[PDB]
Ligand binder design. Structure first.
Ligand SMILES: [Zn+2]
Lengths: 133, 88, 97, 84, 50, 52, 52, 122, 50
RNA sequence: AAACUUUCAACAACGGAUCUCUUGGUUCUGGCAUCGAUGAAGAACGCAGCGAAAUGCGAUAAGUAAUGUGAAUUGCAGAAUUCCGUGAAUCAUCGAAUCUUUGAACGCACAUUGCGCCCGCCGGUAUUCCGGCGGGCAUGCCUGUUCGAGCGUCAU
RNA sequence: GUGAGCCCGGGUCGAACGGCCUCUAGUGCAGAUCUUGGUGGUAGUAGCAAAUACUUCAAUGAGAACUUGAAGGACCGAAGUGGGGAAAGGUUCCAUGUGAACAGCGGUUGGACAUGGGUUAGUCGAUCCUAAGCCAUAGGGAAGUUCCGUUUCAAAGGGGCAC
RNA sequence: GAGACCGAUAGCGCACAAGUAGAGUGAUCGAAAGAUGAAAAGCACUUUGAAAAGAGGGUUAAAUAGCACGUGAAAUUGUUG
RNA sequence: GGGCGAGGCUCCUUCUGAGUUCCCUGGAACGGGACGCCACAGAGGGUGAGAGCCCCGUAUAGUUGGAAGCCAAGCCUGUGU
């Protein structure tokens, strides 16, 4: 149960915020869990997904399909995974939108900012664990 | 002949465009706007038409300066730059 | 005898804000006590007797101590409001008691 | 476009008499002569003096309008007023 | 008429530039609700009111 | 007209004999600048303006 | 709201041969013109005994 | 080409900034004619040129205002655009010193009988 | 894509074509119950129409 | 007997009720005090590669700078991002800026993109002509400065 | 089940809902020349009859009385069914193309729809002048929004000369 | 931040490019209008028509969801019995 | 009369627990069954159907970095014109 007065439990306000959130907020909303190997390596549970990540789909009709994220299409809150496409009538291929909560990240596209994110999340989790233990 | 035949003589203009409020309500002979009361200093408004008041009240336009004021109040009308910011 | 011959609905006052106003008053009192600590939250009031023959059987707190009371207690009139004593120059002492 | 009016350009704008120069600079005659000598403002001669001033004679002194404009910005005017 | 003021001709210029149908790429946008120009003007239907 | 001819001289070294102007029905101004007979408007449009 | 169903200008067309005597929105050029107003039985009107 | 970054602009002084504004305006002037006479990827370049001109003008204005503030640092009267904005009511509000001025009798009374720190035993 | 957008533009006109408007600029709302035709009484004196 | 009219049923029409939904209203409660001549509210006109509107913005024109985040925007086209970075974004924040014609609206006017005046700067053969650019010129009132008027009161 | 109603079967459909006891109300419709919306008979009916009038061949086109060219026949009859303007309109002007809608019949045509193009001045107007008239200023009214006042009971400014 | 409130003829006039479209010389008056599908996967290709479209064949879990689009009542209409 | 002032408060910032385990239906489990785990968090929302443990958030102590104010235990000093 929420206790703070700045927290609202209004369903109308929650849906308005979710469907009118700007792009930087939608990046945080469009997060995906890490694989078990990545979680034990980095001590990180979830991270926002971006282009170049390797993902495995764990929900839906395209389950157990793996591939690279080719587009993070934030306008309909979906991602596109390579080779996870369907055929239009004319025979061309159109990508299939997958929600980031239906995939698991198997390989991270690593750079300086991603390492900073992982390091600060891991440090925060460790200091929370020491404070609460 | 007060109807259709008389309606054929309607080719003058009682009102022109008013410079201040943009409506076609500036009386061409009196030089007084029927809507906003130009060229009087005050804008014409009355309490017997709350619809007319809310058609032109503050916030129905652009708020080109007034919309920036609450953020400046929230930051306390501060001046200067962030410390270590690039510039002159 | 019902007085509803004016436009009474224009100035009907409801009191849904009674608990919120109690909360606001309590928060203001807490802030005042925290600002005034370790001093008391109020001033010392004298004991006075209510006027008229209906209420002269009962005593209550008054506004402030008289100048004669402060002089007989040895408290200067400029020091008295600075140490939590309320001062009333209008009241006089008509009796010894 | 619009028709020009006579006497609004040319020598009438190029020259002014000493009376007009003194009234323009709001000086006395000794101060004006002193400032003209100190700043090197020299007398001039129009081709036709009637085009500049209809009441001009042979003894009328003329000056350049731009020279009087330059004299308008001389800091000695404030010195003259301060001394007065 | 042929005799017109600069202000009047400027407002007529703005009306002439506004008098168009919507571009066809508008309807292909994601979440588009605009189907046609609902403020389109014609010289026989609605007066400019100048 | 003076601003148009000064702008043409400053931008393309173009010397004009006369300039006519009209405000078009869309609201923009159109200027007909007739060049001096010394220069060729076709050559100027080919080299500088690129209108071939 | 206390003003709901009352922000219209409407007058009855009187006793006649055609229509009911409900107040009707004046003016023209829109669907609302001539339509009933202010009644609890009318669309876009004030409800009977508004809640306080 | 056509993208000028603010980091290199912050180090220049006035002369080459006005120069670079001159070129960026000149390639904007030619590629407008290139836009009306042909097509391609040059539209990104005219967009970049417009933003570069905006950035250069911003840098020039900022450096001029910084120099003017340095010049007017120790002067009594400042230009109106260099004076602080706040609101009109804030600018007409009394100064802190004038609002804090008290009378001589009040100062003596506050000096010799201030509000004391005290407690009452229970 | 051009064929699809053109089909969308043609399908956007179906309601106004059923309403028989002369294009998207015809938004005229006519009076289907005029006050002079649906109010008042005819007396012995001056009438409002012949 | 059919057709026609009516009734009953199935399917198909017409029309948009019902049911479910709700980035919206309505009412209450809590907090806060912040418009404008340093030019407001409002109006008009413009600005995107491809927009009419809504939204945003002002010729630095769906925007600039600064801070932060850290890889997009998307309908198409075209370009990305040295990804181990002064750095995408229709991102957030926002202290520096820009801010057209107007409007209490302020040179005089305005049913005119009309007519001026003052002072500088630049260009065209130019002491004179022509053109452009910049800064200014409303009213009432207050304090002060300076220039004055009056046998109004005096001294000399 | 007397009844208001309740329950089930079958078909359709797609995300919520019900029984019992209490609590609560914007709680039960055939009417109000009721409101809004939708739909019939009338009825393929009334009608589409002022302004004298049309016809032939060819082309275009899926389709031609009302598109075009030619060929004929007529009308306006110079106070015109001609050639140009003022007000008003605002792009209706011109070229190219065109599904539907509109042109009370049709339509390949169109003032319709779509994309583009088009309005060049020292001499034509405006701009300048004043008329009938209107508005500032001085000053006086008015609680005031403002009213009167336009030459006033105003210090309301120009020129010249100077050793 | 909430509600024993309303759930698109309700609730603000406005849940939508709403004080908009539109009307009036003007003061002013002032609407109608939400819902395909989880995802456009918004029907390739063939055939008939000048075209609109139709039929095969497809997509979809479903077109008995085809941008006239959730469900699809009644008045009223067509066919069949 | 002056000057320090530990410490505290207000405001933006970094960070926080646990299943996508097996079976059935289904286009898609967020449904049913089984086995667990977290909980100062079983408020709310999203995700292809009713999700504490898929995601954002939610609870509580705190924990990074920054700015400007206020309160303040105490401590140095001038002394009476
Ligand atoms: Zn006006």
């Amino acid at each position: 149960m929420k206790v703070r007065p700045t927290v609202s439990s209004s369903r109308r306000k929650a849906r308005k915020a979710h469907f009118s959130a700007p792009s930087s907020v939608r990046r945080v909303i469009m997060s995906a869990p890490l694989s078990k190997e990545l979680r034990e390596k980095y001590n990180v549970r979830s991270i926002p997904i971006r282009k170049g990540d390797e993902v495995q789909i764990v929900r839906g009709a395209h389950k157990d399909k793996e591939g690279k994220v080719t587009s993070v299409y934030r306008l309909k809150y979906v991602i596109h995974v390579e080779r996870v496409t369907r055929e239009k009538a004319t025979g061309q291929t159109v990508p299939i939108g997958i929600h980031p909560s239906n995939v698991v990240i198997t390989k991270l596209h690593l750079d300086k900012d991603r390492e900073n994110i992982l390091a600060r999340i891991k440090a925060g989790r460790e200091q929370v664990a020491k404070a609460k233990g | 002949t007060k109807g259709t035949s008389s309606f054929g003589k309607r080719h003058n203009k009682t009102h022109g465009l008013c410079r201040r409020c943009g409506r076609r309500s500036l009386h061409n002979q009196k030089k007084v706007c029927a809507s906003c009361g130009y060229p009087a200093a005050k804008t014409r408004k009355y309490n017997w038409s709350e619809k007319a008041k809310r058609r032109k009240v503050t916030g129905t336009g652009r708020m080109r300066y007034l919309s920036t004021v609450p953020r400046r109040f929230k930051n306390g009308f501060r001046t200067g730059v962030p410390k270590g910011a690039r510039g002159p | 005898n019902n007085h509803f011959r004016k436009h009474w609905q224009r100035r009907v006052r409801c009191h849904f804000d009674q608990p919120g106003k109690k909360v606001t008053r309590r928060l203001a009192r807490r802030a005042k006590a925290a600002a005034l600590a370790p001093r008391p939250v109020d001033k010392l009031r004298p004991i006075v007797r209510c006027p008229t023959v209906k209420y002269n059987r009962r005593t209550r707190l008054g506004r402030g101590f008289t100048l004669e009371e402060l002089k007989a207690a040895g408290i200067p009139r400029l020091l008295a409001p600075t140490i939590g004593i309320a001062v009333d120059h209008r009241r006089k002492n008509l009796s010894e008691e | 476009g619009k028709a020009k009016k006579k006497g609004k350009s040319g020598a009438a704008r190029n020259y002014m008499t000493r009376t007009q120069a003194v009234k323009k600079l709001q000086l006395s005659l000794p101060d004006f002569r002193k400032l003209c000598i100190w700043k090197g403002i020299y007398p001039r001669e129009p081709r036709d003096r009637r085009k500049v001033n209809k009441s001009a004679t042979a003894s009328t002194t003329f000056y350049y309008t731009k020279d009087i404009q330059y004299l308008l910005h001389e800091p000695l005017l404030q010195k003259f007023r301060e001394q007065k | 008429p042929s005799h017109k003021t600069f202000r009047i001709k400027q407002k007529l210029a703005k009306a002439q530039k506004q008098n168009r149908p919507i571009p066809q790429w508008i309807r292909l946008r994601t979440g588009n609700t605009i189907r046609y120009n609902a403020k389109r003007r014609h010289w026989r239907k609605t007066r400019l009111g100048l | 007209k003076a601003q148009i001819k000064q702008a043409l001289k400053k931008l393309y070294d173009i010397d004009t004999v006369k300039i006519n102007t009209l405000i078009r029905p869309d609201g923009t101004k159109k200027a007909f600048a007739r060049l001096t007979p010394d220069v060729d408007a076709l050559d100027i449009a080919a080299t500088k303006l690129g209108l071939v | 709201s206390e003003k709901a169903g009352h922000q219209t200008s409407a007058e009855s067309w009187g006793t006649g041969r055609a229509v009911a005597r409900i107040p009707r929105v004046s003016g023209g050029g829109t669907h609302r013109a001539g339509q009933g107003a202010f009644g609890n039985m009318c669309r876009s009107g004030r409800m009977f005994a508004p809640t306080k | 080409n056509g993208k000028v970054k603010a980091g290199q602009l912050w180090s220049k002084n006035k002369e080459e900034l006005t120069k670079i504004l001159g070129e960026l305006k000149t390639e904007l002037s030619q590629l407008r004619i290139q836009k009306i006479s042909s097509s391609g990827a040059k539209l990104n370049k005219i967009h970049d040129l417009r933003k570069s001109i905006a950035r250069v003008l911003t840098v020039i204005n900022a450096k001029q205002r910084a120099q003017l503030r340095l010049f007017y640092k120790n002067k009594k009267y400042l230009p109106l655009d260099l004076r602080p904005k706040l609101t009109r009511a804030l600018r007409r509000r009394l100064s802190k010193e004038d609002a804090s001025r008290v009378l001589e009798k009040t100062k003596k009374r506050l000096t010799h009988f201030p509000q004391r720190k005290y407690a009452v035993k229970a | 894509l051009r064929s699809k957008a053109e089909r969308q533009a043609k399908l956007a006109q179906r309601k106004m074509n059923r309403m028989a408007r002369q294009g998207e600029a015809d938004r005229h709302i006519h009076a289907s119950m005029p006050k002079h035709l649906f109010s008042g009484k005819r007396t012995i004196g001056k009438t409002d129409r012949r």
